[PDB]
Amino acid sequence: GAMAPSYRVKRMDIAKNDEECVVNAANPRGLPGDGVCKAVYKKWPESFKNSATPVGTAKTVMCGTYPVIHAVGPNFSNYTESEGDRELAAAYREVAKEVTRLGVNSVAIPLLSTGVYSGGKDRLTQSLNHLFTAMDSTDADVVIYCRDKEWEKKISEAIQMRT
Ligand SMILES: Cc1nccn1C[C@H](C)O
Ligand SMILES: [Cl-]
Ligand SMILES: [Cl-]
């Protein structure tokens, strides 16, 4: 565990993280994909051996000794708001189980289903609150990665409001 488990946010490429493991915003087929998934594929391509897993689940594959947790959020183009909400919550619960199982002291996480799986909606608050519901019972240091300046401010505000 971390001595004083924390949440932080950084605005940069998650492929340059300073944590003990990474969560990939994966597709269900273990394909190189786009966005976070493509950056992860370029940095840790070995982690895509048998990484395919269903929506709402997480599957960890080692790149050397560095764990890549492939977490599959729903594509809100295909799911109803109700069913997508359930699968997005479930993917984060599976991330918390994997982080715990691995015994890491820190984890780099993106906001699942906020990019090309968002169905064209702003899901910062929805995705971040499912992240908190899952990760709050873990004692890893959690570092949330984003790319947008306004999202960085809103994520930082949400972290600070609870402290
Ligand atoms: C910044 C923003 N606006 C809508 C959605 N997002 C996040 C994705 C990842 O670009
Ligand atoms: Cl960067
Ligand atoms: Cl996405």
Ligand SMILES: [Cl-]
């Ligand atoms: Cl972002």
